[PDB]
């Protein structure tokens, strides 16, 4: 499987950091405090692929932790999940780990492959969790930019 190291920032230029061990939060970082941002290993995985929709998995660089989408309290929810390092990453990732990376103007959206029209989202407020949102274009932010990181 092919992977790329990268960071993501929402369209209000908020960076993503580890809040605790299994959740991310978004905040305005600049200067030296930018080193706190999470580095992802974005893998290019198997799945329904169209011209502007590319299936990917989002793991934390050098960690057996992946973003995944599951029902929690009957609601589609974003979580960070531990995996066996002997088996990951792989091309055939389980559906809960797959996101459709979609190009929108000069930005990116990450739609859950398991839950159509549910997206990786951030709140306008500072220091709030990254979550899975069923709206795109409301108060919640569903578009991002990607920055490439050295191998």
């Amino acid at each position, epitope marked *: 499987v092919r992977s790329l190291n990268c960071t993501l920032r929402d369209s209000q230029q908020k960076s993503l950091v*580890m*809040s*605790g*061990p*299994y*959740e991310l939060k978004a905040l305005h970082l600049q200067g030296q405090d930018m080193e706190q941002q999470v580095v992802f290993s974005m893998s290019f995985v198997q799945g329904e692929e169209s011209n502007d929709k590319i299936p990917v998995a989002l793991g934390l660089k*050098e*960690k*057996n*932790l992946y973003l995944s989408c599951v029902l929690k309290d009957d609601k589609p929810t974003l*979580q*960070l*999940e*531990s*995996v*066996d*390092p*002997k088996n990951y990453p792989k091309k055939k990732m389980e559906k809960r780990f797959v996101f459709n990376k979609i190009e929108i103007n000069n930005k990116l959206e990450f739609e859950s492959a398991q839950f159509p029209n549910w997206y990786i989202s951030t709140s306008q407020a500072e220091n709030m*969790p990254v979550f899975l949102g069923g709206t795109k274009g409301g108060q919640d932010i569903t578009d991002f930019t990607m920055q490439f990181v050295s191998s």
Partner: antibody
Amino acid sequence: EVQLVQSGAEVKKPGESLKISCKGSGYSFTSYWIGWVRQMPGKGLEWMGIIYPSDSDTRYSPSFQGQVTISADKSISTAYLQWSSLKASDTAMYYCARYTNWDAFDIWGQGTMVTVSS
Amino acid sequence: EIVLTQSPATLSLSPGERATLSCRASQSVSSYLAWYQQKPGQAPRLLIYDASNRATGIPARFSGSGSGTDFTLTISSLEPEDFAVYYCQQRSNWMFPFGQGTKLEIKR
């Protein structure tokens, strides 16, 4: 069976260095955070710090930052807690525990009793 | 960061009776609250995770509820093994405070 097994009871004198261990079994050790918790005699639980064994990413409680070192040897599924200079007030039971995406310590070690006295 | 306040400090009851233990957070956070049981001379063990879910192998007589800052642990009918110290815990960003504990003692 998922378990964490800790090293034996230690008896030391103030100023001495010490390293205690926490061994994981029945699961992929590399994949879960390990936390360290102190329990002074007759007192409650206090979180000290946490480490991700895959890349040794470590976070300490402000009360313990610079006073102890948390480390891990993922090749033998072992997490460590170490002091370069023990105090008599470090006399406590120390537990290691596995932290999960449920925001809980689901598996705990049996504890390592550390007695510090001249 | 946040403080967790447990009450009562000692709860004295008999086997067969219902027990209610309280844990109150100083501030409301989005992390999941957990309850731990520590029997005398033993290591703590997870009882409840995310305020109301029983951990693996925990008997049905244990239940949990609450939201916001107010949490409760209930034992519908006490067994002699349930007389132990109970602690609540809720992560605050990267800090992990515990409540000060409640001792459940046998009234005879």
